[PDB]
Amino acid sequence: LGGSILPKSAILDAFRIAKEATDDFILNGQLGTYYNEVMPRSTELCVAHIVNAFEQLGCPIRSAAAYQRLERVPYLPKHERFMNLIYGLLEEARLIDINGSEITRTSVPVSTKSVETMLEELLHDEPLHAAEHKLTSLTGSKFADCITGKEDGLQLIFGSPEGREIVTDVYAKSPINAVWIQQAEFFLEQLVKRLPNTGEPLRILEMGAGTGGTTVKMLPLLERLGVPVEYTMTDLSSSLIAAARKRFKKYPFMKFKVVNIESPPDPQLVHSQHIILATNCVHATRNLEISTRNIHRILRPDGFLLLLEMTEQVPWVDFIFGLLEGWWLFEDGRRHALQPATHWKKILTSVGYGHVDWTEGTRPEANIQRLIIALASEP
């Protein structure tokens, strides 16, 4: 299996070009008001949903006087870490003061706008970011039921077609994700222009491909570039793969396979791939050292990992995904699944990657997610 030549300069020069355009991708992709104008509104909607759930669970937070002691709401033990984050959000919104175990009400009034009016206005005002706001209310309106076990967050999202459509749109269409996928397209296109042509394929493996939020852009891109390629789309979920096998049959350069990031690679995967793509999946594993070491062993020596990772917490993301067991699997010293790029570099370097870089910019959104590239060998 002779694969393409992949000079280090092609990677580093393409990444530098993409990196310097980060703020351009944020503006073009309609994310340039997200941190300062959209996120306070989605955070407000989360908080309102929380207040409603608390009232439903017997906490009179809406009517409580200043300094009133509030009892903790009921919830399943598995939600302890999440609910500490939830109470944190209420404190950041200045509705409560926390003092260790003691929760007390502030003088700040709860908003009088309903969550229905909040959503309606946000959907009308910010239609490009609709998907995550709809998802926020899908679980948010059932928040008391979820944290007590009467409903399950994973079932709510994926058990209905409406939820499945929203979450696909979140991963593919919402600027908060599409910006950096589009930037990865630019990186890869500039990369391929710098490759020798030997007739041999570029071998690309996507981990955690899930709903195909990245995949749906990569395949037309590789189709249009027309250089030999084998694209292996993988995920832990066999249903998501089976669906993708149908959806993406159009493309003849495709392989589809169930692959667990946490598993040691079978011999057939060892040193096989030029590029591993991984969008917001590696953080969901138990141990980042183990996962990134596994990924390293699947890379050819001339290859690299391209992470697309959320590097800063966003309240609506925690509010929704924090309901899911998959958000709390870390057991490697992290206190949250998501980590800043500096931590990712620490892990990546410690398991043998030779060069780590990431996107940055002056816009605040450039800190929310990053492309993080990690070369298997040191240049």
The catalytic residue positions are 171, 283, 309
Which residues between 72 and 101 bind ligand SAH (CB under 6 A)?
none
* Minimal distance, residue 54 CB to ligand SAH, in Å: 29
Task: Tell me whether residue 18 or residue 236 sits nearer to ligand SAH (CB atom).
Answer: 236
Query: 3-class DSSP state for residue 344?
Result: helix
Q: Which two tokens stand for residue 58?
A: 């017997």
Closer Cβ to ligand SAH, 106 or 251, answer by number: 251
Q: What is the closest distance, in whole angstroms, from the C-beta atom of residue 198 to ligand SAH in the complex?
A: 31
Comparing CB distances to ligand SAH, the nearer of 53 and 176 is 176
- What is the Cα Rg of the chain in Å? 22
In degrees, to the nearest 5, what angle opens at C-alpha 79 toward C-alphas 74 and 80?
A: 80
Strand order through the sheet with 355-358: 254-258, 229-235, 202-207, 273-279, 299-310, 369-375, 355-358
- CB 280 to ligand SAH: min, Å: 4
| Minimum CB distance to ligand SAH, residue 235 (Å) | 5
Among 25, 171, 256, 330, binds ligand SAH (CB under 6 A): 171
Residue in the shown chain whose Cβ atom is closest to ligand SAH = 210
Secondary structure (DSSP) of 208-264:
S-TTTTTHHHHHHHHHHH---EEEEEEES-HHHHHHHHHHTTT-TTEEEEE--TTSP
Query: Distance (Å, rounded) from C-alpha 224 to C-alpha 378?
Result: 31
Residue 73 vs 209, nearer CB to ligand SAH:
209
End-to-end CA distance of the chain: 24
Query: Rounded CA gap, 59 and 155, in Å?
Result: 26
CB of 202 to ligand SAH, least distance (A): 20
CA-closest candidate to residue 278, choices 262, 255, 267: 262
Interface with ligand SAH (CB under 6 A), residue total 21
Q: Report d(CA 260, CA 322) in Å as an integer.
A: 22
Site for ligand SAH in 197-236 (CB under 6 A): 207-214, 235-236
Site residues for ligand SAH, 244-303, by CB under 6 A, read 260-262, 279-281, 284-285
CB nearer to ligand SAH: pick between 73 and 374: 374
Q: Which residue of 30, 33, 148, 237 would you call a contact of ligand SAH, by CB under 6 A?
A: 237
The residues binding ligand SAH (CB under 6 A) are: 171, 207-214, 235-237, 240, 260-262, 279-281, 284-285
